[PDB]
Amino acid sequence: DWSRTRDVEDIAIVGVATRFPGDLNTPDEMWEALLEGKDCVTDLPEDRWTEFLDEPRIAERVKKARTRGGYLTDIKGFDSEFFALSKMEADNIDPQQRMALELTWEALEHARIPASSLRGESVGVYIGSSTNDYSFLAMSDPSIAHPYAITGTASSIIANRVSYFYDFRGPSVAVDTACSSSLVATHQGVQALRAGEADVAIVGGVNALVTPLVTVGFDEVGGVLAPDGRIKSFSSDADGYARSEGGGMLVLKRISDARRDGDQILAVIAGSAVNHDGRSNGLLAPNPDAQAEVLRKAYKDAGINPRDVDYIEAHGTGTILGDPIEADALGRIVGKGRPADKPALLGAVKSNLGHLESAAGAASLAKMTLALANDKLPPSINYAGPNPYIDFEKERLKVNDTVSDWPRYSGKAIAGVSGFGFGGANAHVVMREVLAGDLVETEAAQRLLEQAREELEAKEAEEPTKQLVPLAVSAFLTSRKRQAAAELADWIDSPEGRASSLESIGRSLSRRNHGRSRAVVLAHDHDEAIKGLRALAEGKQHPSVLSADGPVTNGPVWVLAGFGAQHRKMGKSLYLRNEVFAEWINKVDALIQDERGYSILELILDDNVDYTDATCEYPIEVVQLVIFAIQIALGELLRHHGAKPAAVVGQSLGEAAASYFAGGLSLADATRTICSRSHLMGEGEAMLFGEYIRLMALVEYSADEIKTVFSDYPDLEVCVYAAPTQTVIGGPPDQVDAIIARAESEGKFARKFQTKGASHTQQMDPLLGELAAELQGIEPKPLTTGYFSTVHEGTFIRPGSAPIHDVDYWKKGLRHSVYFTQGIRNAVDNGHTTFLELAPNPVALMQVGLTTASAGLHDAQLIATLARKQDEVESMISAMAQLYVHGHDLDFRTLFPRRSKGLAGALDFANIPPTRFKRKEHWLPAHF
Amino acid sequence: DWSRTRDVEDIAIVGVATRFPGDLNTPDEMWEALLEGKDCVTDLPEDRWTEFLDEPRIAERVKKARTRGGYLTDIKGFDSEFFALSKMEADNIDPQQRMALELTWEALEHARIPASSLRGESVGVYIGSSTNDYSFLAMSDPSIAHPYAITGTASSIIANRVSYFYDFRGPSVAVDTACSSSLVATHQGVQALRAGEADVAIVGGVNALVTPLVTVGFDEVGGVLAPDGRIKSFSSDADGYARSEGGGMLVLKRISDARRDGDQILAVIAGSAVNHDGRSNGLLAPNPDAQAEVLRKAYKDAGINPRDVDYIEAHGTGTILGDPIEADALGRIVGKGRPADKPALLGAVKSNLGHLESAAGAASLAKMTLALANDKLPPSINYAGPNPYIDFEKERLKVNDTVSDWPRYSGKAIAGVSGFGFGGANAHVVMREVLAGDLVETEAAQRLLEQAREELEAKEAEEPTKQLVPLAVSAFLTSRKRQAAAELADWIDSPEGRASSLESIGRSLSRRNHGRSRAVVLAHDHDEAIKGLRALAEGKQHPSVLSADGPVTNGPVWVLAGFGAQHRKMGKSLYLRNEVFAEWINKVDALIQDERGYSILELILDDNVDYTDATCEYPIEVVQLVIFAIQIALGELLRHHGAKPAAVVGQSLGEAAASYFAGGLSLADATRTICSRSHLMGEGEAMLFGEYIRLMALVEYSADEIKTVFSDYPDLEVCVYAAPTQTVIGGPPDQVDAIIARAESEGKFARKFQTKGASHTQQMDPLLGELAAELQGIEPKPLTTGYFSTVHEGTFIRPGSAPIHDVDYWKKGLRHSVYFTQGIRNAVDNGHTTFLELAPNPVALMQVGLTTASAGLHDAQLIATLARKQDEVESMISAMAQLYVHGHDLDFRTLFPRRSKGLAGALDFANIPPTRFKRKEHWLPAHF
B398/B390 Cα distance (integer angstroms): 11
C-beta atoms of B191 and A196 within 8 A: no
How big is chain A by its Cα radius of gyration, in Å? 35
How big is chain B by its Cα radius of gyration, in Å? 35
A704/A394 Cα distance (integer angstroms): 101
Contact present, A791 and A812 (Cβ < 8 Å): yes
C-beta atoms of A195 and B156 within 8 A: no
Contact present, B330 and B295 (Cβ < 8 Å): yes
A149/B213 Cα distance (integer angstroms): 11
The count of C-alpha atoms lying within 13 angstroms of the C-alpha of A703, restricted to the half-sphere facing its C-beta, is 13
Which of B860-888 are b and which e, b meaning 16 or more Cβ less than 10 Å from the residue's Cβ?
bbbbbbbbeeebbbebbbbbbbbbbbbbb
Angle at A319 between CA A317 and CA A324, to 5 degrees: 95
C-beta atoms of A213 and B142 within 8 A: yes
- Chain A, 178 to 217: residues with Cβ < 8 Å from chain B are 178, 181, 184, 188, 191, 195-197, 212-214, 216-217
A179 CB contacts (<8 Å, ≥6 apart)?
A130, A315, A355, A357, A358, A360, A419, A420, A421, A422
Facing residue for A184 by CB, picked from B161, B173, B221:
B173
Contact present, B724 and B702 (Cβ < 8 Å): yes
**Number of other CB atoms surrounding residue B23 within 10 Å:** 14
Sheet holding A786-788, edge to edge: A796-797, A786-788, A647-650, A557-560, A834-837, A861-863
Q: Identity (one letter) of the amino acid at B139?
A: M
Which residues sit opposite A519 in a β-bridge?
A473, A547
Nearest-CA neighbor of B863 among B443, B466, B397, B548? B548
The Cα-based distances of B101 to A19, A278, B80, B756 in angstroms read 37, 14, 11, 67
C-beta atoms of B276 and A178 within 8 A: no
Angle at B122 between CA B121 and CA B127, to 5 degrees: 120
Interface-testing mutation among B164, B180, B191, B211, with chain A (most A C-beta atoms within 10 A): B164
C-beta atoms of A276 and B168 within 8 A: yes
- Chain B, 146 to 175: residues with Cβ < 8 Å from chain A are 147, 149-151, 154-157, 159-161, 163-175
Backbone angles phi, psi at B103, to 5 degrees: -65, -35
Give the H or E element holding residue B546.
strand B545-548
Interface-testing mutation among A136, A141, A164, A294, with chain B (most B C-beta atoms within 10 A): A164
A142/A152 Cα distance (integer angstroms): 16
B792 Cβ under 8 Å from any chain A Cβ: no
A763/A687 Cα distance (integer angstroms): 10
Angle at B232 between CA B226 and CA B237, to 5 degrees: 80
Chain breaks in chain B (C to N over 2.5 A) after: 441
A211/B201 Cα distance (integer angstroms): 37
Contacts of A125 in chain B (CB under 8 A): 276
Print the SS3 string covering B795-812. Answer: CEECCCCCCCCCHHHHHH
Coil, strand, or helix at residue B558?
A: strand
A447 CB contacts (<8 Å, ≥6 apart)?
none
- Chain B, 254 to 293: residues with Cβ < 8 Å from chain A are 273-280, 283-284, 290, 293
Burial of residue B96, with CB atoms counted within 10 A of its CB: 0-12 exposed, 13-18 middle, 19 or more buried: buried
Give the H or E element holding residue A529.
helix A526-537
A350/A41 Cα distance (integer angstroms): 10
C-beta atoms of B172 and A167 within 8 A: no
Facing residue for B170 by CB, picked from A6, A122, A275:
A275
- Chain A, 106 to 125: residues with Cβ < 8 Å from chain B are 119-120, 122, 125
The Cα-based distances of A580 to A149, A260, A564, A629, A636 in angstroms read 55, 20, 26, 13, 8
C-beta atoms of B161 and A283 within 8 A: yes
B521 CB contacts (<8 Å, ≥6 apart)?
B470, B471, B473, B485, B529, B532, B533, B536, B544, B545
A517/B697 Cα distance (integer angstroms): 111
B273/B294 Cα distance (integer angstroms): 6
The Cα-based distances of B339 to B326, B342, B387 in angstroms read 20, 6, 22
A271/A186 Cα distance (integer angstroms): 10
Facing residue for A421 by CB, picked from B160, B297, B928:
B160
Contact present, B875 and B406 (Cβ < 8 Å): no
C-beta atoms of A178 and B278 within 8 A: no
Coil, strand, or helix at residue B274?
A: strand
Contacts of B154 in chain A (CB under 8 A): 130-131, 176, 178, 423
Q: Identity (one letter) of the amino acid at B844?
A: A
Polymer length in residues for chain B: 928
Q: List the domains of chain A with CATH numbers.
A: 11-436 (3.40.47.10), 443-551 (3.30.70.3290), 560-572+590-687+756-883 (3.40.366.10), 694-755 (3.30.70.250)
**Number of other CB atoms surrounding residue B377 within 10 Å:** 25
The Cα-based distances of B1 to A426, B296, B413 in angstroms read 41, 12, 21
C-beta atoms of B149 and A278 within 8 A: no
Nearest-CA neighbor of A353 among A571, A702, A71, A134? A71
Polymer length in residues for chain A: 928
- Chain A, 539 to 558: residues with Cβ < 8 Å from chain B are none
A417/A250 Cα distance (integer angstroms): 15
A681/A37 Cα distance (integer angstroms): 83
C-beta atoms of A130 and B157 within 8 A: no
Contact present, B160 and A421 (Cβ < 8 Å): yes
Print the SS3 string covering A704-759. Answer: HHHHHHCCCCCCCEEEEEEECCEEEEEECHHHHHHHHHHHHCCCCCCEEECCCCCC
Q: Identity (one letter) of the amino acid at B867?
A: A
B686 known ligand binder: no
Distant-in-sequence contacts of A479-483, Cβ < 8 A, 24+ apart: A480/A517, A481/A515, A481/A517, A481/A518, A481/A519, A481/A536, A482/A536, A482/A537, A482/A538, A483/A537, A483/A916
- Chain B, 870 to 909: residues with Cβ < 8 Å from chain A are none
B438/B12 Cα distance (integer angstroms): 10
Contact present, B883 and B77 (Cβ < 8 Å): no
A314/A330 Cα distance (integer angstroms): 10
